[PDB]
């Protein structure tokens, strides 16, 4: 089991950390959602499906910077919504193929009444998402830590 991002930076077997840079809608109105879709950004596969089935959760999602200040959030995991920042680990997605399968995560961030102006700065950390991988075979329990950065400013109109 290992993962890779859409621009090809990898986290190998056993886990680790990696930075992910994402384009964001440049303008978002108070009350509307800024959608951050990581399923186009993060892909994983099982290295031994003949024998091992892999289980993958979103263990923790954390908000930083402009996102923690200026937005209210939820996270969708495999189509089901939870509070963001997270208050529990999600149920597990099954990885049973060597095919690259997206990690089914998306953030829905709504600017709050006070947001107005530059609400997220280019280059800033907006989130840290911890993918947790176990299996039905041994004691492996690894963390793949994804640091999510904005590629551009997000403006909330006044
Ligand atoms: O994707 C499956 C497995 O790939 C990796 O393991 C590959 C292996 C093996 C193996 C080979 C022969 C006998 N038993 C296990 C690990 O990332 C492990 O955590 C994971 O469950």
Domain CATH code at residue 129: 2.60.40.1090
Distance 144 CA to ligand 1 centre (A): 16
**91 CA distance to ligand 1 middle (Å):** 21
Method: X-ray
Distances (CA, A) of 122 to 25, 30, 65, 99, 153: 12, 19, 11, 33, 4
> Using CA atoms, how far apart are residues 131 and 146, in angstroms rounded to an integer?
8
Q: What is the resolution of this structure in A?
A: 1.9
CA 131 to ligand 1 center in whole angstroms: 17
Cβ-count burial 7-27 (b if 16+ within 10 Å, e if not): eeeebeeebeeeebbbebeee
The preferred substitution site among 4, 48, 131 for testing ligand 1, maximizing ligand atoms within 8 Å of CB, is 48
DSSP secondary structure, 108-121, as one string: EEEE-TT--EEEE-
- In the reported structure, the alpha carbon of residue 97 is separated from the centroid of ligand 1 by a whole-number distance in angstroms of 12
In the chain, the number of structural domains is: 1
Q: Is 77 in the pocket of ligand 1 (CB under 6 A)?
A: no
Domain region containing 142:
1-158
């Amino acid at each position: 089991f290992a993962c890779k991002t859409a621009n090809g930076t990898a986290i190998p077997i056993g886990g680790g950390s990696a930075n992910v840079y994402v384009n964001l809608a440049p303008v978002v109105n108070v009350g509307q959602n800024l959608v951050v879709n990581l399923s186009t950004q993060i892909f994983c596969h099982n290295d031994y499906p003949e024998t091992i089935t892999d289980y993958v959760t979103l263990q923790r999602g954390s908000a930083y910077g402009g996102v923690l200040s200026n937005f209210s959030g939820t996270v969708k995991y495999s189509g089901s919504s939870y509070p963001f920042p997270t208050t529990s680990e999600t149920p597990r997605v099954v990885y049973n193929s060597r095919t690259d399968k997206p990690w089914p995560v998306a953030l829905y961030l709504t600017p709050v009444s006070s947001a107005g102006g530059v609400a997220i700065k280019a280059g800033s950390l907006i989130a840290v998402l911890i993918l947790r991988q176990t299996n039905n075979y041994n004691s492996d329990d690894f963390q793949f830590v994804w640091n999510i950065y904005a590629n551009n400013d997000v403006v909330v109109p006044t």
